[PDB]
Ligand binder design. Structure first.
Ligand code: HEM
Length: 182
């Protein structure tokens, strides 16, 4: 089942409110045709260059950042082009991205919330319609809607009374979330 980690700072927030606010602040990195600048709005893979166990991206305007973890593959110019696919196990949100391929991995200096055991598996043939792609490209674009939808389904599968409209404290009482120090 989904497992959620959250700083006690967010104990009284709903998941939906936290994610809406986090993504709005992160913003859109404008990873779109004509606007991609390597080292500015591409993010990076570990070990990379275009595959690995992590993909991480910091905002173009502040130190907010996220890390996607799993077994990830990116097609770049190969068909179907510009698709992230593979197995997505986790999304960690916070600020101050540390590490990189030269460090052996990425980590957030201030991890606010993480969602693990996501169990999302997207074949390459689904291209940009795959869930893995939509979740991560959404986050790159400042839009947590796809992530919210996947969390909501995982929470309902535990119990239909649980949803993205539950608070982190409610999800902890329900056995799917645990707090970390502020
Ligand atoms: C090392 C990481 C990455 C690099 C170097 C990279 C590079 C690029 C480049 C060069 C373009 C084309 C810009 C243009 O046509 O002018 C592009 C577009 C795009 N990339 Fe990436 N990308 C990276 C990561 C990702 C990831 C992780 C995703 C998805 C989760 C993604 C999804 C897309 C999409 C959807 C487009 C737009 C394609 C279109 O509308 O034609 N990219 N990227």
């Amino acid at each position: 089942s989904i497992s959620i980690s959250y700083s006690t700072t967010y104990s009284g927030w709903t998941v939906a409110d936290y994610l809406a606010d986090w993504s709005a602040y992160f913003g859109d990195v404008n990873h779109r045709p004509g606007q991609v600048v390597d080292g500015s709005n591409t993010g990076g893979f570990n070990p990379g260059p275009f595959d690995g166990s992590q993909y991480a991206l910091k905002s173009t305007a502040s130190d907010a950042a996220f890390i996607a973890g799993g077994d990830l593959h990116h097609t770049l110019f190969s068909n179907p082009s510009h698709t992230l696919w593979g197995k997505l196990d986790s999304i960690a949100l916070g600020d101050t991205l540390t590490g990189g391929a030269s460090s052996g991995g990425y980590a957030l200096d201030s991890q606010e919330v993480s969602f693990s055991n996501l169990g999302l598996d997207s074949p390459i043939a689904q291209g940009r319609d795959g869930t893995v792609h939509k979740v991560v490209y959404g986050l790159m674009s400042g839009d947590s809607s796809a992530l919210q939808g996947q969390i909501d389904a995982l929470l309902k599968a535990v119990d239909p009374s649980l949803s993205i409209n539950s608070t982190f404290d409610q999800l902890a009482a329900a056995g799917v979330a645990h707090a970390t120090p502020a």
